[PDB]
Amino acid sequence: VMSSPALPAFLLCSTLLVIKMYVVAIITGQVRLRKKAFANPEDALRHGGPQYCRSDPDVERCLRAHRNDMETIYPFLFLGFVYSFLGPNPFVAWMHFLVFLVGRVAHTVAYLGKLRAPIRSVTYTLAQLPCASMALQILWEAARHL
Amino acid sequence: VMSSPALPAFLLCSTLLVIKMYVVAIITGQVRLRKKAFANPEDALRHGGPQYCRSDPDVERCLRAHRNDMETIYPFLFLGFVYSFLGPNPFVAWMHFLVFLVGRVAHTVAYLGKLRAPIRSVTYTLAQLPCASMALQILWEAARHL
Amino acid sequence: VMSSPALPAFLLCSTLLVIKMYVVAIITGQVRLRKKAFANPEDALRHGGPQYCRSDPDVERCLRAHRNDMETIYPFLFLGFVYSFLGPNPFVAWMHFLVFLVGRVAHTVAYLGKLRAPIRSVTYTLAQLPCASMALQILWEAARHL
Numbered sequence: 001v002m003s004s005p006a007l008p009a010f011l012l013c014s015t016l017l018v019i020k021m022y023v024v025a026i027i028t029g030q031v032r033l034r035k036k037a038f039a040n041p042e043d044a045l046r047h048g049g050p051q052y053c054r055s056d057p058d059v060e061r062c063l064r065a066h067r068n069d070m071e072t073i074y075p076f077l078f079l080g081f082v083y084s085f086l087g088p089n090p091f092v093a094w095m096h097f098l099v100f101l102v103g104r105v106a107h108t109v110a111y112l113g114k115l116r117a118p119i120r121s122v123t124y125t126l127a128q129l130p131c132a133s134m135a136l137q138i139l140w141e142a143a144r145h146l
Numbered sequence: 147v148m149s150s151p152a153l154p155a156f157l158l159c160s161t162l163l164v165i166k167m168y169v170v171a172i173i174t175g176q177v178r179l180r181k182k183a184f185a186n187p188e189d190a191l192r193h194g195g196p197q198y199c200r201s202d203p204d205v206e207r208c209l210r211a212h213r214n215d216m217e218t219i220y221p222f223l224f225l226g227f228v229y230s231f232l233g234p235n236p237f238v239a240w241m242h243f244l245v246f247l248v249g250r251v252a253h254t255v256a257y258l259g260k261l262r263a264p265i266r267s268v269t270y271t272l273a274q275l276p277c278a279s280m281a282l283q284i285l286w287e288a289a290r291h292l
Numbered sequence: 293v294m295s296s297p298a299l300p301a302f303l304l305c306s307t308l309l310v311i312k313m314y315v316v317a318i319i320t321g322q323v324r325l326r327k328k329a330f331a332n333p334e335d336a337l338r339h340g341g342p343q344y345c346r347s348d349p350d351v352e353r354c355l356r357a358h359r360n361d362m363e364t365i366y367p368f369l370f371l372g373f374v375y376s377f378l379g380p381n382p383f384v385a386w387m388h389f390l391v392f393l394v395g396r397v398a399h400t401v402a403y404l405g406k407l408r409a410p411i412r413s414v415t416y417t418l419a420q421l422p423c424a425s426m427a428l429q430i431l432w433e434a435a436r437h438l
């Protein structure tokens with residue numbers, strides 16, 4: 001974990017974000033149970049009957065939050081890991097990881113909590129900024145070593 | 147690959163799971179062809195006409211299995227890789243990877259095979275357990291190096 | 293970045309592909325705005341009224357392209373990284389990464405541009421070939437170190 005000074009901070013933030021995705025998965029399951037809205041007939045038949053194989057807006061919302069996480073957090077897992085080894089300024093790297101962590105936690109709160117627009121959109125944008133920054137830095141480092 | 151004693155086992159299990167996801171992708175395509183259920187008008191027009199741009203429950207099921215894989219296997223690729231470098235007991239690490247591999251293969255069989263509830267849900271839970279375990283271990287290691 | 297001769301090429305191609313996924317995300321948002329097709333009532337109410345919380349075929353197409361990217365590019369991020377450290381022939385490794393990069397960029401163009409079948413399907417197949425190749429190579433290396 002001490003292979004680079006920024007690595008511990010990266011691993012802390014990334015792992016917290018993975019756990020945060022698992023929290024969304026757990027919430028999704030609980031909403032399915034509460035609202036009796038199952039994706040599969042085999043699930044529905046165990047939990048009240050075939051009529052409960054149905055869509056639900058809250059389930060769909062949970063799935064959107066989880067999908068958006070997959071569209072954003074998974075790239076961060078890659079970019080942040082590589083970036084940790086490019087010798088960035090420790091504080092600067094910290095700030096990249098923290099902005100992503102805070103932005104993404106806020107995104108899930110804004111999504112699942114149905115907060116007014118443009119709160120969710122702003123949190124998404126905030127979090128994407130350090131990702132764009134790391135991506136460009138990796139490009140320069142990779143290109144110059146070709 | 148010998149950068150850590152647990153790494154070969156991790157790389158074997160992870161790569162098998164990636165191949166298992168590709169198998170789901172291949173099955174999905176075959177179901178689309180068999181059931182004539184295409185997502186795109188350009189596909190449908192090559193394969194019988196515009197009426198074949200349509201949803202199908204078996205195609206949707208394949209997509210759910212693939213999506214669930216993305217929600218679970220992708221985090222494992224990250225967590226398991228990092229965990230391999232934290233000096234875990236070789237046998238203990240093996241067990242983490244094997245439980246995930248077996249649980250996830252069983253999950254796909256239970257999903258695509260339409261096995262009775264709660265078989266699929268149990269396989270998902272089984273496989274998530276070693277992921278939660280690795281995530282916590284990474285948190286402790288990262289935090290203590292800050 | 294010089295931990296292995298193939299690594300710079302891998303990091304260049306992978307990071308470009310992550311940026312290419314972000315481009316799809318940006319396009320998706322712009323299509324939502326242009327076509328007034330929002331996934332969430334809170335978005336719709338800021339942008340003209342509740343009737344604009346609705347699906348749209350172009351938005352759905354963008355989401356399919358992005359999802360297909362998640363089904364294919366994310367595995368490449370893992371496989372290509374590991375493969376970079378297995379001492380492959382530099383030119384051979386380059387070719388694996390370039391075929392994936394070109395195939396995937398072409399895939400997005402074919403998907404979003406609604407090009408005739410089987411153009412998109414062929415680009416997908418082309419790009420999967422080096423992934424299958426790397427996966428098998430990782431399997432052999434991992435297995436022989438057990």
Ligand SMILES: Cc1ccccc1-c1ccc(-c2ccc3c(c2)c(C)c(CC(C)(C)C(=O)O)n3Cc2ccc(Cl)cc2)cc1F
Binds near residue numbers: 121125128131318324
């Ligand atoms: C900077 C970056 C780097 C890497 C990847 C993506 C991006 C990136 C690119 C673009 C955007 C990006 C693009 C449109 C954006 C925004 C951000 C924001 C914050 C708004 C809301 C505003 C502030 C106008 C408001 O409502 O007042 N719009 C309009 C909008 C609103 C709803 C929907 Cl569904 C789609 C589009 C956000 C990003 F994170």
Ligand SMILES: Cc1ccccc1-c1ccc(-c2ccc3c(c2)c(C)c(CC(C)(C)C(=O)O)n3Cc2ccc(Cl)cc2)cc1F
Binds near residue numbers: 026032033043274
């Ligand atoms: C432990 C862990 C670590 C990390 C991430 C997630 C989790 C995790 C957390 C919670 C669960 C978790 C939550 C509800 C669960 C289960 C597991 C299981 C196995 C059941 C079925 C039972 C056994 C009751 C039955 O039917 O008899 N329920 C109820 C249920 C059933 C169907 C649907 Cl769609 C949603 C919820 C599964 C997990 F893997």
Ligand SMILES: Cc1ccccc1-c1ccc(-c2ccc3c(c2)c(C)c(CC(C)(C)C(=O)O)n3Cc2ccc(Cl)cc2)cc1F
Binds near residue numbers: 168178
């Ligand atoms: C080789 C590999 C390695 C790893 C993972 C997957 C794969 C992999 C496996 C299979 C395929 C794979 C499977 C069916 C394929 C193709 C490739 C191609 C190119 C076609 C179009 C043809 C050429 C027949 C035409 O239309 O003339 N079909 C038929 C088809 C068409 C549309 C839909 Cl929705 C589903 C299936 C593509 C792959 F990339």
Ligand SMILES: CCCCCCCCO[C@@H]1O[C@H](CO)[C@@H](O)[C@H](O)[C@H]1O
Binds near residue numbers: 024113
């Ligand atoms: C990481 C997981 C974050 C979970 C954030 C959940 C925010 C829940 O927020 C709640 O949402 C309800 C309906 O959506 C509203 O009725 C409540 O007013 C609101 O408190």
Ligand SMILES: CCCCCCCCO[C@@H]1O[C@H](CO)[C@@H](O)[C@H](O)[C@H]1O
Binds near residue numbers: 166169258259
């Ligand atoms: C990694 C890929 C695993 C593929 C597992 C596929 C299991 C197929 O299982 C089959 O499913 C059919 C319909 O779903 C049933 O009619 C059959 O009884 C059953 O054998």
Ligand SMILES: CCCCCCCCO[C@@H]1O[C@H](CO)[C@@H](O)[C@H](O)[C@H]1O
Binds near residue numbers: 312315316400401404
């Ligand atoms: C990485 C992002 C790639 C973007 C490729 C977008 C290709 C757009 O292609 C355009 O699509 C329109 C409708 O789909 C058609 O009407 C136009 O003829 C076509 O030029």
Ligand SMILES: N[C@@H](CCC(=O)N[C@@H](CS)C(=O)NCC(=O)O)C(=O)O
Binds near residue numbers: 067124316
């Ligand atoms: N897949 C996204 C691509 C763009 C994006 O990520 N937008 C942000 C800010 S508006 C978001 O939170 N999207 C909601 C979602 O993905 O469900 C979408 O459909 O909107």
Ligand SMILES: N[C@@H](CCC(=O)N[C@@H](CS)C(=O)NCC(=O)O)C(=O)O
Binds near residue numbers: 025063214
């Ligand atoms: N996205 C999941 C989150 C929870 C989850 O992964 N549940 C397991 C056990 S019930 C599952 O197999 N879900 C089916 C699916 O994701 O389609 C869901 O909608 O259910």
Ligand SMILES: N[C@@H](CCC(=O)N[C@@H](CS)C(=O)NCC(=O)O)C(=O)O
Binds near residue numbers: 171175
């Ligand atoms: N999830 C894919 C699995 C197979 C696949 O990736 N097919 C390629 C070639 S036909 C594709 O471009 N699929 C379109 C898509 O995923 O939306 C599907 O539903 O088709």
Ligand SMILES: CCCCCCO[C@@H]1O[C@H](CO)[C@@H](O)[C@H](O)[C@H]1O
Binds near residue numbers: 134137
């Ligand atoms: C998409 C808008 C976000 C801009 C990200 C800024 O990212 C910055 O880019 C500079 C030039 O590449 C780099 O020198 C710098 O290290 C990086 O932080």
Ligand SMILES: CCCCCCO[C@@H]1O[C@H](CO)[C@@H](O)[C@H](O)[C@H]1O
Binds near residue numbers: 275278282
């Ligand atoms: C979510 C329920 C799964 C529990 C995972 C247990 O995980 C365990 O956690 C302990 C305390 O952090 C660790 O000491 C131990 O290494 C780890 O295997």
Ligand SMILES: CCCCCCO[C@@H]1O[C@H](CO)[C@@H](O)[C@H](O)[C@H]1O
Binds near residue numbers: 421424425428429
């Ligand atoms: C799914 C069809 C794609 C085939 C990928 C070919 O992949 C090849 O496999 C050989 C045998 O494992 C390896 O010796 C070779 O390094 C690899 O490039």
